[PDB]
Design a protein around this ligand. Structure first.
Ligand code: 9LP
Lengths: 230, 12
């Protein structure tokens, strides 16, 4: 039931590695301070997303055993998880407690950022569904590691090697769910179920960005590799 | 090609 010493070591190591990201306050303070045009928000998005890719590669490299995987499989895992990890991190920031009325303004500002209405409803439905799970910091860090170490990604040659790296993270998350929320025995299953909803953001990620209400969609060379954009 | 990703993965 309780975490073993090795699992406690793994958990604190994943947490330390995950904490190298930008502070949620830095991100939300900028959006809440003043309203920006769709052009200004697109530029904020590309800068934020390019920095997230860099942080994600650094976190991924720290995952136990990731460096021992086949080099082509490493690329496939990174490319297959980058968009999902960016949305899961946006969902985490969206659901951080802010003073009265601030989350309403944050939501209204994102709704009016330049993104098309067809993508707003599935995006907020996911952020709100994530928020109802009342996830802790450790749960977001482990879920992000689980999303990266998905053995079912397209182009993965050695799935078993990936399964072996993912299995101890799933074991730790399941124990945490049983500890954090003993009143809700479905908590682990609902966290894993949300991972299925997260995968839907892959199919339309390129269309979401290209349909942003701006004249020119200029991306960075690193985003062009990770996203399916020119 | 994913040359920037490959570079970020293979550095250090
Ligand atoms: O910048 C973001 N998200 C990043 C995700 C990586 C984070 O990096 S890290 O350093 O912490 O790891 C920084 C924020 C964006 C902003 C970009 C400016 C206009 C408003 C949305 N954004 C998203 C969004 C929406 C559509 C797509 Cl196509 C992509 C993401 N949803 C959001 C929800 C939140 F609450 C928010 F604060 C920020 C949100």
């Amino acid at each position: 039931m309780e975490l073993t010493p090795d699992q406690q070591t793994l958990l604190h190591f994943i947490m330390d590695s995950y904490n190298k990201q930008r502070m949620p306050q830095e991100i939300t303070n900028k959006i809440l301070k003043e309203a920006f045009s769709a052009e200004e928000n697109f530029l904020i998005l590309t800068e934020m997303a390019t920095n997230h890719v860099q942080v994600l590669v650094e976190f991924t490299k720290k995952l136990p055993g990731f460096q021992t995987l086949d080099h082509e499989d490493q690329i496939a895992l990174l490319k297959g998880s980058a968009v999902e990890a960016m949305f899961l991190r946006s969902a985490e920031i969206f659901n951080k407690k802010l003073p009265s009325g601030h989350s309403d303004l944050l939501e209204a500002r994102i709704r009016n950022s330049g993104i098309s209405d067809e993508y707003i409803t599935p995006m907020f439905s996911f952020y709100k569904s994530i928020g109802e799970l009342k996830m802790t910091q450790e749960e977001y860090a482990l879920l992000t590691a689980i999303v990266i170490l998905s053995p079912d990604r397209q182009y993965i040659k050695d799935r078993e090697a990936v399964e072996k790296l993912q299995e101890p993270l799933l074991d730790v998350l399941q124990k945490l769910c049983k500890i954090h929320q003993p009143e809700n025995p479905q908590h682990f299953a609902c966290l894993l179920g949300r991972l299925t909803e997260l995968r839907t953001f892959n199919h339309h990620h390129a269309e979401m960005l290209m349909s942003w209400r701006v004249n020119d969609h200029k991306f960075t060379p690193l985003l062009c590799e990770i996203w399916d954009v020119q | 090609d994913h040359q920037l990703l490959r570079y970020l993965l293979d550095k250090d």
